[PDB]
Design an enzyme around this catalytic site. Sequence first.
Site, PDB file in Angstrom:
ATOM      1  N   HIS A  89       6.972  -3.467  -1.209  1.00 53.35           N
ATOM      2  CA  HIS A  89       8.315  -3.785  -0.703  1.00 53.35           C
ATOM      3  C   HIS A  89       9.079  -4.673  -1.684  1.00 53.35           C
ATOM      4  O   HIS A  89       9.477  -5.796  -1.385  1.00 53.35           O
ATOM      5  CB  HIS A  89       8.268  -4.407   0.698  1.00 53.35           C
ATOM      6  CG  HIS A  89       7.155  -5.387   0.906  1.00 53.35           C
ATOM      7  ND1 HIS A  89       7.069  -6.578   0.220  1.00 53.35           N
ATOM      8  CD2 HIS A  89       6.082  -5.351   1.729  1.00 53.35           C
ATOM      9  CE1 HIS A  89       5.990  -7.230   0.606  1.00 53.35           C
ATOM     10  NE2 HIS A  89       5.374  -6.508   1.522  1.00 53.35           N
ATOM     11  N   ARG A 123      15.990 -13.971   3.730  1.00 54.14           N
ATOM     12  CA  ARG A 123      14.978 -12.927   3.738  1.00 54.14           C
ATOM     13  C   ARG A 123      15.558 -11.523   3.831  1.00 54.14           C
ATOM     14  O   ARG A 123      15.060 -10.615   3.163  1.00 54.14           O
ATOM     15  CB  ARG A 123      14.013 -13.166   4.904  1.00 54.14           C
ATOM     16  CG  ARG A 123      12.965 -12.100   5.090  1.00 54.14           C
ATOM     17  CD  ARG A 123      11.864 -12.179   4.055  1.00 54.14           C
ATOM     18  NE  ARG A 123      10.812 -11.216   4.359  1.00 54.14           N
ATOM     19  CZ  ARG A 123       9.788 -11.456   5.170  1.00 54.14           C
ATOM     20  NH1 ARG A 123       9.667 -12.635   5.758  1.00 54.14           N
ATOM     21  NH2 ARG A 123       8.881 -10.518   5.392  1.00 54.14           N
ATOM     22  N   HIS A 164       7.592 -13.453  13.168  1.00 55.36           N
ATOM     23  CA  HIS A 164       7.366 -14.816  12.712  1.00 55.36           C
ATOM     24  C   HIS A 164       7.627 -15.859  13.788  1.00 55.36           C
ATOM     25  O   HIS A 164       7.550 -17.056  13.497  1.00 55.36           O
ATOM     26  CB  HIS A 164       8.233 -15.115  11.486  1.00 55.36           C
ATOM     27  CG  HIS A 164       7.715 -14.504  10.222  1.00 55.36           C
ATOM     28  ND1 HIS A 164       7.542 -13.146  10.068  1.00 55.36           N
ATOM     29  CD2 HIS A 164       7.323 -15.068   9.056  1.00 55.36           C
ATOM     30  CE1 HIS A 164       7.069 -12.899   8.860  1.00 55.36           C
ATOM     31  NE2 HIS A 164       6.927 -14.048   8.226  1.00 55.36           N
ATOM     32  N   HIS A 182       0.289   1.824   1.347  1.00 52.17           N
ATOM     33  CA  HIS A 182       0.576   0.540   1.978  1.00 52.17           C
ATOM     34  C   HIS A 182       0.215   0.587   3.460  1.00 52.17           C
ATOM     35  O   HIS A 182       1.032   0.321   4.340  1.00 52.17           O
ATOM     36  CB  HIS A 182       2.030   0.136   1.760  1.00 52.17           C
ATOM     37  CG  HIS A 182       2.315  -1.300   2.076  1.00 52.17           C
ATOM     38  ND1 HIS A 182       3.484  -1.924   1.708  1.00 52.17           N
ATOM     39  CD2 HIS A 182       1.587  -2.231   2.735  1.00 52.17           C
ATOM     40  CE1 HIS A 182       3.465  -3.176   2.122  1.00 52.17           C
ATOM     41  NE2 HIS A 182       2.325  -3.388   2.751  1.00 52.17           N
ATOM     42  N   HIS A 234       1.883  -9.069  -2.485  1.00 52.94           N
ATOM     43  CA  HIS A 234       2.963  -9.464  -1.588  1.00 52.94           C
ATOM     44  C   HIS A 234       3.255 -10.922  -1.923  1.00 52.94           C
ATOM     45  O   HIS A 234       2.478 -11.810  -1.564  1.00 52.94           O
ATOM     46  CB  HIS A 234       2.530  -9.273  -0.133  1.00 52.94           C
ATOM     47  CG  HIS A 234       3.475  -9.827   0.888  1.00 52.94           C
ATOM     48  ND1 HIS A 234       3.854  -9.113   2.001  1.00 52.94           N
ATOM     49  CD2 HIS A 234       4.070 -11.037   0.999  1.00 52.94           C
ATOM     50  CE1 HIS A 234       4.665  -9.848   2.739  1.00 52.94           C
ATOM     51  NE2 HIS A 234       4.814 -11.019   2.152  1.00 52.94           N
ATOM     52  N   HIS A 267      -1.707 -11.356  -0.740  1.00 51.53           N
ATOM     53  CA  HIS A 267      -0.707 -11.499   0.305  1.00 51.53           C
ATOM     54  C   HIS A 267      -0.420 -12.973   0.535  1.00 51.53           C
ATOM     55  O   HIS A 267      -1.337 -13.796   0.547  1.00 51.53           O
ATOM     56  CB  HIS A 267      -1.176 -10.843   1.602  1.00 51.53           C
ATOM     57  CG  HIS A 267      -0.071 -10.540   2.563  1.00 51.53           C
ATOM     58  ND1 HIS A 267       0.649 -11.522   3.204  1.00 51.53           N
ATOM     59  CD2 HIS A 267       0.424  -9.363   3.004  1.00 51.53           C
ATOM     60  CE1 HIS A 267       1.547 -10.962   3.992  1.00 51.53           C
ATOM     61  NE2 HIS A 267       1.430  -9.653   3.889  1.00 51.53           N
ATOM     62  N   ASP A 320       0.335 -14.566   3.116  1.00 57.37           N
ATOM     63  CA  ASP A 320      -0.283 -15.119   4.313  1.00 57.37           C
ATOM     64  C   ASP A 320      -1.686 -15.652   4.055  1.00 57.37           C
ATOM     65  O   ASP A 320      -2.163 -16.491   4.821  1.00 57.37           O
ATOM     66  CB  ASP A 320      -0.318 -14.067   5.417  1.00 57.37           C
ATOM     67  CG  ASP A 320       1.004 -13.937   6.134  1.00 57.37           C
ATOM     68  OD1 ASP A 320       2.047 -13.875   5.455  1.00 57.37           O
ATOM     69  OD2 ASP A 320       1.008 -13.892   7.377  1.00 57.37           O
ATOM     70  N   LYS A 375      -5.616  -6.763  -2.623  1.00 58.30           N
ATOM     71  CA  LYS A 375      -4.294  -7.106  -2.138  1.00 58.30           C
ATOM     72  C   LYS A 375      -4.140  -8.620  -2.208  1.00 58.30           C
ATOM     73  O   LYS A 375      -5.009  -9.361  -1.771  1.00 58.30           O
ATOM     74  CB  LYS A 375      -4.075  -6.594  -0.714  1.00 58.30           C
ATOM     75  CG  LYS A 375      -2.759  -7.009  -0.079  1.00 58.30           C
ATOM     76  CD  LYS A 375      -1.563  -6.432  -0.822  1.00 58.30           C
ATOM     77  CE  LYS A 375      -0.263  -6.737  -0.108  1.00 58.30           C
ATOM     78  NZ  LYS A 375      -0.261  -6.205   1.284  1.00 58.30           N
ATOM     79  N   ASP A 388       3.937   0.453   5.031  1.00 60.35           N
ATOM     80  CA  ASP A 388       3.748  -0.861   5.665  1.00 60.35           C
ATOM     81  C   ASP A 388       3.556  -0.691   7.177  1.00 60.35           C
ATOM     82  O   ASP A 388       4.265  -1.270   7.998  1.00 60.35           O
ATOM     83  CB  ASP A 388       4.917  -1.804   5.340  1.00 60.35           C
ATOM     84  CG  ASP A 388       4.512  -3.261   5.255  1.00 60.35           C
ATOM     85  OD1 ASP A 388       3.323  -3.590   5.415  1.00 60.35           O
ATOM     86  OD2 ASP A 388       5.402  -4.090   5.006  1.00 60.35           O
ATOM     87  N   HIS A 414      -1.570  -0.708   6.727  1.00 58.75           N
ATOM     88  CA  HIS A 414      -2.260  -1.733   7.502  1.00 58.75           C
ATOM     89  C   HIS A 414      -3.152  -1.022   8.510  1.00 58.75           C
ATOM     90  O   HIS A 414      -2.656  -0.419   9.463  1.00 58.75           O
ATOM     91  CB  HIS A 414      -1.278  -2.649   8.228  1.00 58.75           C
ATOM     92  CG  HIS A 414      -0.472  -3.524   7.324  1.00 58.75           C
ATOM     93  ND1 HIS A 414      -0.663  -4.884   7.246  1.00 58.75           N
ATOM     94  CD2 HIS A 414       0.540  -3.237   6.475  1.00 58.75           C
ATOM     95  CE1 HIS A 414       0.188  -5.397   6.380  1.00 58.75           C
ATOM     96  NE2 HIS A 414       0.929  -4.418   5.897  1.00 58.75           N
TER      97      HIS A 414
HETATM   98 NI    NI Z   1       3.832  -7.172   2.454  1.00 60.18          NI
HETATM   99 NI    NI Z   2       2.289  -4.861   4.264  1.00 62.02          NI
END
Ligand code: NI
Ligand code: NI
Lengths: 238, 238, 569, 569
Positions: free
Chosen positions: D274, D338, D322, D136, D248, D221, D223, D219, D362, D138
């Site tokens: 996650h 959350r 965020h 995981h 995700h 995600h 977003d 992936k 992550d 990034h």
């Molecule tokens: Ni994620």
């Molecule tokens: Ni992530």
Amino acid sequence: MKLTPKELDKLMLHYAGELARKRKEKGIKLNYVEAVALISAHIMEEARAGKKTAAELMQEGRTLLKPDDVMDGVASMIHEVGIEAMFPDGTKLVTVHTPIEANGKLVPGELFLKNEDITINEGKKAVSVKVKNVGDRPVQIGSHFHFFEVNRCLDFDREKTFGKRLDIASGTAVRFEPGEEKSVELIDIGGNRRIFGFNALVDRQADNESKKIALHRAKERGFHGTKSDDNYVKTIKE
Amino acid sequence: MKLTPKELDKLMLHYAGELARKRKEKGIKLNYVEAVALISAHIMEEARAGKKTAAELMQEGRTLLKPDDVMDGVASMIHEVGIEAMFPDGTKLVTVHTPIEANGKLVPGELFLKNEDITINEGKKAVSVKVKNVGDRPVQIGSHFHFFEVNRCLDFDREKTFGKRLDIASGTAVRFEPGEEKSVELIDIGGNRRIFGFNALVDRQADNESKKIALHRAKERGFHGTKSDDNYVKTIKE
Amino acid sequence: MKKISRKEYVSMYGPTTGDKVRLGDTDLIAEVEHDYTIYGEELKFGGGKTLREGMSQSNNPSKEELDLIITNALIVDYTGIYKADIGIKDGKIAGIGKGGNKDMQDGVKNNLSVGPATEALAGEGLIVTAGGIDTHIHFISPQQIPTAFASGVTTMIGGGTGPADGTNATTITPGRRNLKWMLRAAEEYSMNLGFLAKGNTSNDASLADQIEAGAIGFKIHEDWGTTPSAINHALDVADKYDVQVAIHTDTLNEAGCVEDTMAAIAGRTMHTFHTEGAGGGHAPDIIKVAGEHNILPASTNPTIPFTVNTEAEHMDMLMVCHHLDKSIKEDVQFADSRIRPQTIAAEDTLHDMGIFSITSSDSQAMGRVGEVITRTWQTADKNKKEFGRLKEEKGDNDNFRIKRYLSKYTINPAIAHGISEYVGSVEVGKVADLVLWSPAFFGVKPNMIIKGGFIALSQMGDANASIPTPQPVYYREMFAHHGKAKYDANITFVSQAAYDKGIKEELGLERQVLPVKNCRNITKKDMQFNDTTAHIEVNPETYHVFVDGKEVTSKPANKVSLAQLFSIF
Amino acid sequence: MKKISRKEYVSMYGPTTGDKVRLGDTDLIAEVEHDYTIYGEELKFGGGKTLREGMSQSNNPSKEELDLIITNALIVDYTGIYKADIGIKDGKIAGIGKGGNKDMQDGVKNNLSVGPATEALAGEGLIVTAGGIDTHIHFISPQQIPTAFASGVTTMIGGGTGPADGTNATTITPGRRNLKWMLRAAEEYSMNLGFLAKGNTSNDASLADQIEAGAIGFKIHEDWGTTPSAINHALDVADKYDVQVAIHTDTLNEAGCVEDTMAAIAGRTMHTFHTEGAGGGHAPDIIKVAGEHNILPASTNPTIPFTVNTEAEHMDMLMVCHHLDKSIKEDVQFADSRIRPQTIAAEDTLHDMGIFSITSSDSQAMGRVGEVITRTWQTADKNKKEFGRLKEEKGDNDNFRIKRYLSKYTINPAIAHGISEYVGSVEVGKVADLVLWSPAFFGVKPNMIIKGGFIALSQMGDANASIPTPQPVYYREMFAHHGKAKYDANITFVSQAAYDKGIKEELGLERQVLPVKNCRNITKKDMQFNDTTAHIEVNPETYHVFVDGKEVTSKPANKVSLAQLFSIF
Ligand code: NI
Ligand code: NI
Ligand code: NI
Ligand code: NI
């Protein structure tokens, strides 16, 4: 059945012998192939029966065919019939020697020889050396072995045998039983007299200079009958 | 003659049997190969004569060799002799089952088994489902078929059988005669429980979410005993 | 969860753990030590059975999907006697274990995955062993190769050029040109092949050239002159090139006795043929070298087992091959010093004790190429009848003795000739040279041969029959035996030096070409189940054999197993 | 035959069978299960010791002579906890076992032969594990790679192009050109690398092109929009190309809830990041998918172990990433739905139960790349403190729990991303990615990293010092980290399709390039020691978690092990 190639070959042989036996019953004089096959098939069947030993079969293979049962010339062509048969104790080779006796005059391949003897190793003078086997095992020496380098258990005057071999027929041999003592004839080795191998006692040109090196090496390695003088002087290459 | 390879093979077999019969006449107890060949050659000759049917030959192949005619161990090694022979109505296969009866104690390859039973599918709980064949044709189901997807003519509570197979010995089967009704035991399918094929009713991971899709597909395709509730809600991938 | 009686379970899938099976018509009993199966998940092929799309054949197979799987096989190997599934991929053994479909079954690893590309071979109720290895081949006739193949041998190592008199006596392929002849002829056959060169020379350059020309080792034979000088030179070159040396010692004691030969060997690795000496060797005491650490002692099959007909047969055979005369006392003296029923009797017991480590043929040179395995198991059966069950056994079985005798023609010759990384055992990663045996016919007549991962020979009925079983049934060449398929299924073993010089491309060889390795650093301790070293004394007069001070002998057999029950001739 | 006290024996060669060792400053106790050594024949390097010419280094080595041997190593692997010697040849693990010289020692096999070409690495008193695998990542900064390397991670799988906002949120390397950028940048680093593509599209051609351009998976995600349509399309393409999919999920429930996402997955293999949901996912019940057969559930390290500072830290972190405002009730409602300390507490117990199977980072996206292993062992220690010793233990040890937690970052991620034939465990045939641990520092600070069979990182003192030990000691790049040596020691994982199209030659890559495989046919049952499937229910109101009807929770920790004892900051 899971027959092997051997089983197929033996089945073919059995029926060749069966044909030979049928022809013999009809009164036909058998030829070379028929006689060979008849003997082989009889041996195989007897071994299958399991009531006779292999030696018995070797003797019995010689009574199947009388001389009058085969063609002229057949007996002199069959020196020996060998056949492998399976007894109760496994596969054994049975060989029948001279199964049929000669009765006619026809000899295929007959040899007509001159009655004159052959003189071998002509021009080579032979010396005589007395040799005794002081070991407990038999020793046999061939015609072209370098006699200087024979088994170290043989005892004889090695100095007189350097560069020599047995003055016997090529490919023959002289045997020495344990404790046996006898005299042999030795001639000089011919050609370039380049002796390599045999015990690694010479491994070079044979001559008087190399005879001293060979005698010293033989004495160091315990070859009987070797008398090389003490206070040996080494050379630059030994 | 225009002999084929088959004719050459059968001629060889006939003469192997002839050799076996000759040895039997001589009083030799036959071994495995000889017994097999003798039975085969007898059947071929009888079929050539054209006076007997293939079934008669199947029964007759069992009377050729008494137990005392063969070696110890032979009878237990010959389970079945098959031979193809040409009758007046063409080529037929004749198989003789257990032609010779055992009389000795020698069993090649003899199996010495523990007397303990084997527990298969240990740790798997078995449910019982009643199944009826409402079709007019027999249906047979193997041990590892996904029982949810059996022939649509079988009627049973399909919902209880999802993700399950028959709790029987691997490679065995359960038969359902037309109109037959019986109960069977079902265990959960093991491994990753990824069911692909069988009627294309699941073709994905087996779970509660996919059981609804499977039930709906089964009902649409007329699988008996399928009760999936109306007002079905489709998913994005069906 | 259901209960299954052992009888029906064994009838369906073969013997399981704790079951015992008789080997052939012998008295040797094999016990299954372990089982890799999950009860209730066995692989069966047929109509309505498990090996079908979506049940045991995967619809989403792994990428290591098998080409061939043998289900429910009883493996008899030196590594153990156990039940498993054997997976074959790309000519190698890919996995040993459960086998099946991970979608529907629990214990399936990626190397044992059955998918749509997998062929099924049923092995329930059958025995799987490694292909036999024969290391004393006289290449006298090509017809020996099919004969040895049909008996369970998959690798032949030896030398020769054909029915020439030099080959009739020696396992020697002499020189580069003759090596090229035999290597190009080898492309014909369904057999792993490797060739021995002439070691009988004192010229180092001549020795090295033969190795670089493709030979995997040397043979030293008394017919070309087994002298200490040649032995020393050949061993020196072999140590430089990592190839094995085999020796047929001087029976006449011409250049020396057995201790002189051992002095010439000088503690280096040596493979001795027919160490008991009926096939040749220092009379009467060549057999003593079988206790040395640096010696790999082999025996030839004509002397085992010792029977009532053995001595007379060997005597007459010797009188024929050497053209001896019964009216000459010297020929009789040679023959009597050569045969020695005492050493022949001792040889069987030395096999039972683990002193002898390899069985071989000496084919058409006083030996039977199609009888190595059969005579090995006959010797094992005779030894069990005489001496009873071995003391190294663990249970009411003969598993230890079975492993000891099986090693004599599978793994020990492979270690001896540096090919035990390719063949010799049923192990993952090795070449798939496998033999299928029905236990009733074990050791005499196999079911089928798998060569390079494909079926090359099998029992087969007539081609026109409606099924493969009906008569006549004999061994026939299968598809791996034909066309260009035989090039993929067969190996020609060469030396590392020849392999590095591109012997394959130079000679245009289409078979697989592999180098031998690890030939010089092995001793008697590297033989599986046959690693017993001892001081062996032979009486010069009575020819009696003593091991560690105790006399060793066996009595002859008037009847053996695996002989007349199984063969028409 | 001599007697040696256990104390001095362990001081000389490390713990032996039956001995137990504490792992770090935790309460986990590891017991040595088996020993491959022959007592009296141990390999020791030094002056006057055994590893010398003619004693333990062979003067006549086998041809499979080792490049590197690790002597007297305690192996901690999912396959067992045992003592052996590890032999490395040509970047692979060549053998596990005794090791030594066959001339002078009994039980030495050809694959474990020490000769003149072998380097010696002493492992007595040390632990050897496989290199960690972080799935995981990034790829936000290159400096993450050395940080993860120094903690024991040898493979990083993830996506990104750098500190771009798309990468700060997602592990996505989008498109062929960006894949080429990252694949050519990868040539710099001492780490195994593989890259995930963008799965967030409904265009099949766009999805397929990224896989053929070198990505090992997708992936998805939120977003970029986690919609059922994109999930369905990405899974279809992945099934056609045999690559993994990571997801995700949609925290906002915009297109649907968790069951709609599971319906879009449609029973196909999926790797969930996650899964407890603090890092994102269907609020509040994404954690329920951790009981499904087709889900590979992973957790990120910021939520484990659950501590007193966890909730406030995660709340403030969420408000920052965020850009939320405390004066807006909708932002508060989002934040409360959350974080959920209930699910965070349940996550530790689910790790102890084997429901969660993978631990990951992550990294720099609410996760710490240098703390995956440390937080995994902290979670194990906390769980042992709370729930006591596991009931699957066999003896007065924690061996089962040790294997369960070690699998979470070694073998399970490797299986999940189709690289478990190369890395993930200490097994023969696998890539020699190994980590050396002193037991006092186990799980927090390793001794050295072996990468591709060569030392790449180690603790090291100052270069001018007379010995390597004196201060300052920190982790420094070794020789496998430099020059052209790093190309031989490192792998770039690609898809099978890209590998077949010559991605290595097209992009001019000098690292090893290997294809991933077996990604689509694995389920939760393929995870070692973490294969527990269960029905998980989450209360929509109280956020409580029930597994098989019983409430699952853990209590927070006010102090953890492996934290302040070992680090200056
Ligand atoms: Ni994620
Ligand atoms: Ni992530
Ligand atoms: Ni010989
Ligand atoms: Ni020979």
